[PDB]
Amino acid sequence: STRRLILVGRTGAGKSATGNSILGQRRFTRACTTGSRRWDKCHVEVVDTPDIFSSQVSKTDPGCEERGHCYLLSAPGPHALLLVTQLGRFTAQDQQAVRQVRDMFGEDVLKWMVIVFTRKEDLAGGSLHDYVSNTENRALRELVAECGGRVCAFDNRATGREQEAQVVQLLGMVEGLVLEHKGAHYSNEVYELAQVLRWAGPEERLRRVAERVAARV
């Protein structure tokens, strides 16, 4: 009935392009933004993210207002976090983005995480399972295992049936994950505060949610 996804990862990973592919729209910038698509009888909601996963987030988003906005847009919690990364370019910056995500949501959030690889065409027609299996990048290897081997490849220039197939594959994985959690979305003490304060006005809700995020990072 509803699937809430959040796109996370470094700047230039391909978050915005991936979101456009999923939504089938040219939808996706200092702020979090959102889009959605009605598929069958399911409402797929995608939150795209700005520069909030760098080592400079502390200077870019000092009172955690933008990190707070991400929570409000995804409340009561995501069914999956999509960690977007570029095929052949898993860098120190990608590793920094993963740590920011952990800091921002909690260690348990990797149990709701799917890794999306952009630039699929760089496999030159070869499979992703082989590429993931034979990479010399230890840190990528580790991350894939921490995310239960949930990996998926996108060519964000794909249109037509090639695009439908990559999106269908990703949504299948998200369903798999949701069933693993017996239908539960990810939650923590910040999402709970957002829900508790759901009757309050948007200004106090944002202020108090930003405040809870700041206390934990």
Ligand X SMILES: Nc1nc2c(ncn2[C@@H]2O[C@H](COP(=O)(O)OP(=O)(O)O)[C@@H](O)[C@H]2O)c(=O)[nH]1
Binding residues for GTP: 9-17, 119-121, 156
DSSP run (H or E) holding 142: helix 138-146
Q: Convert 121-136 to b/e letters by CB count within 10 Å (16 or more is b).
A: eebeeeeeeebbeeee
Instruction: Determine if 16 is a binding residue for Mg ion (CB under 5 A).
Output: yes
Distance CA 151, CA 137 (A): 15
Min. distance of Cβ 65 from Mg ion in angstroms? 19
Instruction: Determine if 17 is a binding residue for ligand X (CB under 6 A).
Output: yes
Structure tokens at 81: 């976090």
Q: Which of 3, 6, 16, 57 binds ligand X (CB under 6 A)?
A: 16
Least Cα distance to 15 among 176, 156, 140, 164 occurs for 156
In the complex with ligand X, the residue whose CB is nearer, 10 or 205, is 10
Instruction: Determine if 14 is a binding residue for ligand X (CB under 6 A).
Output: yes
- Given the structure tokens 């983005």, which residue do they identify? 97
Min. distance of Cβ 15 from Mg ion in angstroms? 5
46 contact choice in Mg ion, ligand X, none (CB below 5 to 8 Å, kind-dependent) = none
3 contact choice in ligand X, Mg ion, none (CB below 5 to 8 Å, kind-dependent) = none
Instruction: Determine if 85 is a binding residue for ligand X (CB under 6 A).
Output: no
Torsion of CA 68, 71, 75, 80, to 10 degrees: 180
For Mg ion, which stretch binds (CB under 5 A), given 12-20, 58-66, 149-157, 159-167?
12-20
Distance CA 165, CA 158 (A): 10
Instruction: Determine if 119 is a binding residue for ligand X (CB under 6 A).
Output: yes
Instruction: Determine if 21 is a binding residue for Mg ion (CB under 5 A).
Output: no
Q: Which of 156, 170, 210, 212 binds ligand X (CB under 6 A)?
A: 156
Instruction: Determine if 156 is a binding residue for Mg ion (CB under 5 A).
Output: no
Q: Which of 11, 25, 55, 127 binds ligand X (CB under 6 A)?
A: 11
Distance CA 62, CA 60 (A): 6
Instruction: Determine if 98 is a binding residue for ligand X (CB under 6 A).
Output: no
What angle (nearest 5°) sits at the alpha carbon of residue 192, between those of residues 188 and 198? Answer: 150
Q: Which residues contact ligand X (rule: CB under 6 A)?
A: 11-17, 84, 118-120, 154-157
